């Protein structure tokens, strides 16, 4: 018989094999369509989820009840120290797909990057790209290099730069810097390639990719939760108290007579550590890192035009389970995928953004900087020292 009282089914099939993702670094499954017209640029970046916090802002959507009313708002800090371009890699269209065609690597490559290429660095002699870099200083090699670049000019269509992180500049344990292919979207391929050939071995900061009040897509791996039962992993009803063989289950897997259990039926398995591409996360603040002209410039982070203090986005006692954000960072609206410390791919949108909400200009009023390691009540240490007065530790 039919099921009596209808109800929409639990969980989406558009997300499954609900298995542990192969990758850790979230792949960009599609870069935006390079119109050939606008100038060249990078489409993606690779940051790190340092931590959350508040903002306060005046909102300007006329019509709303909240028009010209200061709301608060959660935000993620994605610490994003500049990447280093160490390669380009040409692709060519085929009817089979999109074959990689030619990879030209830079001359010098950091041990940050070289780390990646060995499973055990302690034990290696660190001999990678050793016979490669010989090419970059002779007649023969330099000529072959030029012919490779020329061939890419003749044949290739898509060009991706290879860059990698500056694992050096982070509070993370790891030294093995994440590489990633990032796509150069812009003018003609010959122009496109000579841009990336100029950028080779060079820094690239965040502000060169992204701008403020820009919708971007966060790509990463979800905070993993191990083996989980069907009630956790699918949010199935619990069965009642009296159930004899347990109650965090599904009762009827399936009907008798497709005499197999279907792929659509809810089973217990891996919950979390899935790959996920959340879209439309507006950049409220691209924040300038600590720098030196005479003394430190720690202010330039979490100070606003209306606050004017001497904060950084770092709260008291740091971001928890992370560190100090001593580098440039972006500040997205809302939560994003994954854990603290997780490497996170940003990506420019796939989508022509023209909604009132997606063109809204964000002027921040106040960044909360109170500790997250307990219930914080002081924004800065100087404020605390004022409020408390002197302590026995003096």
């Amino acid at each position: 018989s039919h099921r009596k009282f209808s109800a929409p089914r639990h969980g989406s099939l558009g997300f499954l094999p609900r298995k542990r993702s192969s990758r850790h670094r979230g792949k960009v499954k599609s870069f935006p369509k390079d119109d050939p017209s606008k100038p060249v640029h990078l489409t993606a970046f690779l940051g790190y989820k340092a931590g959350m916090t508040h903002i306060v802002r005046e909102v300007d959507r006329p019509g709303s009840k909240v028009n010209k009313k200061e709301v608060v708002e959660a935000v993620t800090i994605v610490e994003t120290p500049p990447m280093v371009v160490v390669g380009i890699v040409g692709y060519v269209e085929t009817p089979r797909g999109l074959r990689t065609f030619k990879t030209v690597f830079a001359e010098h490559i950091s041990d940050e990057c070289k780390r990646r290429f060995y499973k055990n660095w302690h034990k290696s002699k660190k001999k990678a790209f050793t016979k490669y870099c010989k090419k970059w200083q002779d007649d023969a090699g330099k000529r072959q290099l030029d012919k490779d670049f020329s061939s890419m000019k003749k044949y290739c269509q898509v060009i991706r730069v290879l860059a990698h992180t500056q694992m050096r500049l982070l509070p993370l344990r790891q030294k093995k810097a994440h590489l990633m292919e990032i796509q150069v979207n812009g003018g003609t391929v010959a122009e496109k390639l000579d841009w990336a050939r100029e950028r080779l071995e060079q820094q690239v900061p965040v502000s060169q990719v992204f701008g403020q009040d820009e919708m971007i897509d966060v790509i990463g791996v979800t905070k993993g939760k191990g083996y989980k039962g069907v009630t956790s992993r699918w949010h199935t009803k619990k069965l009642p108290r009296k159930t004899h063989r347990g109650l965090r289950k599904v009762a009827c897997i399936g009907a008798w007579h497709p005499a197999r259990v279907a792929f659509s039926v809810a089973r217990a398995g891996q919950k979390g550590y899935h790959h996920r591409t959340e879209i439309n996360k507006k950049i409220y603040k691209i924040g300038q890192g600590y720098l030196i002209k005479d003394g430190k410039l720690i202010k330039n982070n979490a100070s606003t035009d209306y606050d004017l203090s001497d904060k950084s986005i770092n709260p008291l006692g740091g971001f928890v389970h992370y560190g100090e954000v001593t580098n440039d960072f972006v500040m997205l609206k809302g939560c994003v995928v994954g854990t603290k410390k997780r490497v996170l791919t940003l990506r420019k949108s796939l989508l022509v953004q023209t909604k009132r909400r997606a063109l809204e200009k964000i002027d921040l009023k106040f960044i909360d900087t109170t500790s997250k390691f307990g219930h914080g009540r002081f924004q800065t240490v100087e404020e605390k020292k004022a409020f408390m007065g002197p302590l026995k530790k003096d």
Binding site: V56, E70, V72, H375, R377
Partner: protein, 63 residues
Amino acid sequence: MKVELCSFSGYKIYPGHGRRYARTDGKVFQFLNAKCESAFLSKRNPRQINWTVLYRRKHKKGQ
């Protein structure tokens, strides 16, 4: 962003945090956190409780 003061302890309450109580007499209280609010609801006279501002004013601490 009018920073308010905790009706128990005395600390300031920054926009994000804490909770707002609206008693039927028709007067309102702000609590920094639950710790304050619990002492308030259990009727603890904050001048008796050391860590509050009201106590330390009463006992002339600092200065």
